[PDB]
Design a protein around this nucleic acid. Structure first.
Ligand SMILES: Nc1nc2c(ncn2[C@H]2C[C@H](O)[C@@H](COP(=O)(O)NP(=O)(O)OP(=O)(O)O)O2)c(=O)[nH]1
Ligand SMILES: [Mg+2]
Ligand SMILES: [Mg+2]
Length: 430
DNA sequence: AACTATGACG
DNA sequence: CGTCATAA
């Protein structure tokens, strides 16, 4: 079924207001209330990085200053991200993420895509389940939180959302050919049943709720996941794609949210994903390149082949700190102190990684930014990471960046640094 | 003065 | 290898 891109069953599971749930689980007083997670509190009340659905009802969003959020939502409750060594420490959320990833890993191969989401390749699990209870009809009861995108439709409770969900689910299940084990639609349905079980396990064992998308590829699975958030899952069939894409803004598709998506819209003079079908593969390749052109040609038809990579661990482990405006580091001692702070956090995380995952990083990347520099990185350099020693890593990091200081004065450092980034990479087994 | 992963290109 | 893109 590869020709039509119906060869696999892929899901994307994403936690609902993740950081907030983590804080709510720990502090019961925050449950079922407009709440948000904030980083730092000194500048404009701190930056919001997560928002409960109750808070979103007031217009509160990520990236908003807490002071501004309070203007929209006076009774907004806030949880502060932990600070260690003068910077944000996200260990609590990383540990919570592990809880969830470990549960998902029981059901199938997963690809960690973020701190709060992972792709699941359910093709094999579906096949196994299909042979079990073969020929047995699938009850609506097995899909208590599933939406079938595009349904209900046609002539024939619906004014309310749950009623709408049920009607669509009934139409879908009624039309399913259960006797053909090879049917893509049947395979998606079975995948949805498994995902219901996965999400139940996650909630029962962690207390966290999540949403999911089930489809034939990662892009459609990700898109589907967001259609009925929170605490719901959505199945997007191959057949639902034409109508779904007909009014779907191009920027909403994974990897098209940036410049490429903007160029597709501007160069082609179109707004929705579906409009891409009128162009030949060659035409798209001419405008956007061989790889991008082929990808777009297939994608607008609901077809994509990016595999769910069997990777549950990060390929890099890093620490970074910004020093905006007048806080830019202007002294040798300051720069050295901050490098040590980052190096110490990095050392802790690395040591844990080595113990937990039987591997060691072999390269240390040092990135900095100087004030007045438009570029994200004024300098990027590497050196060998031979030992998990904060002092050595900090000293080595300083050695590689020290020549960027142009100040004659011994004490002073210029131009001022607005960012420091230490990253461990090139992991090897041990 | 948003703050603290992966992948493709050349 | 370093940069730029995309992103939660
Ligand atoms: N520091 C920082 N953290 C972020 C940012 N974006 C997301 N996070 C962190 C905080 C988030 O809680 C977590 C998950 O990211 P999502 O899945 O994108 N959002 P959530 O789960 O919150 O809500 P829902 O999915 O229901 O819409 O990652 C950011 O720009 N900056
Ligand atoms: Mg989420
Ligand atoms: Mg997410």
């Amino acid at each position: 079924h590869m020709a039509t891109g119906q060869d696999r069953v892929v899901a994307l599971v994403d936690m609902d207001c993740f950081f907030v749930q983590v804080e709510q689980r720990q502090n019961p007083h925050l449950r079922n209330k407009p709440c948000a997670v904030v980083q730092y509190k000194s500048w404009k009340g701190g930056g919001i990085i997560a928002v409960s659905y109750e808070a979103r009802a007031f217009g509160v969003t990520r990236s908003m200053w807490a002071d501004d959020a309070k203007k929209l939502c006076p009774d907004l409750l806030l949880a502060q991200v932990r600070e260690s060594r003068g910077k944000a420490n996200l260990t609590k959320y990383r540990e919570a993420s592990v809880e969830v990833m470990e549960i998902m890993s029981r059901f199938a191969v997963i690809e960690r895509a973020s701190i709060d989401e992972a792709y699941v390749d359910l093709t094999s699990a579906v096949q196994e389940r299909l042979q079990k209870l073969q020929g047995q009809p699938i009850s609506a009861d097995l899909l208590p939180s599933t939406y079938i995108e595009g349904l209900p439709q046609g002539p024939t409770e619906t004014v309310q959302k749950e009623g709408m969900r049920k009607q669509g689910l009934f139409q879908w299940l009624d039309s399913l050919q259960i006797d053909n084990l090879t049917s893509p639609d049947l395979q998606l349905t079975v995948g949805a049943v498994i995902v219901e079980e996965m999400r139940a396990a996650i909630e029962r064992e962690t207390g966290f709720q999540c949403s999911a998308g089930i489809s034939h590829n990662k892009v459609l699975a990700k898109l589907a996941c967001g259609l009925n958030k929170p605490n719901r899952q959505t199945l997007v069939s191959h057949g639902s794609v034409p109508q779904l894409f007909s009014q779907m803004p191009i920027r909403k598709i994974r990897s098209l949210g940036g410049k490429l998506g903007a160029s597709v819209i501007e160069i082609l003079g179109i707004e929705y994903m579906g409009e891409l079908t009128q162009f030949t593969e060659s035409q798209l390749q001419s405008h956007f390149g061989e790889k991008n052109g082929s990808w777009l040609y297939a994608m607008c038809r609901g077809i994509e082949h990016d595999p769910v990579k069997p990777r549950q661990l990060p390929k890099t482990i890093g620490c970074s700190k910004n020093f905006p405006g007048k806080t830019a580091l202007a002294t040798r001692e300051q720069v050295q102190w901050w490098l040590l702070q980052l190096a110490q956090e990095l050392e802790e995380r690395l040591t844990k990684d080595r113990n937990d995952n039987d591997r060691v990083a072999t390269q240390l990347v040092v990135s900095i930014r100087v004030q007045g520099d438009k570029r994200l990185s004024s300098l990027r350099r590497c050196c060998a990471l031979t030992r998990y020693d904060a002092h050595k890593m900090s000293h080595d990091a300083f050695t590689v960046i020290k020549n960027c200081n142009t100040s004659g004065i011994q004490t002073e450092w210029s131009p001022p640094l607005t960012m420091l980034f230490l990253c461990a990479t090139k992991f090897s087994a041990s």
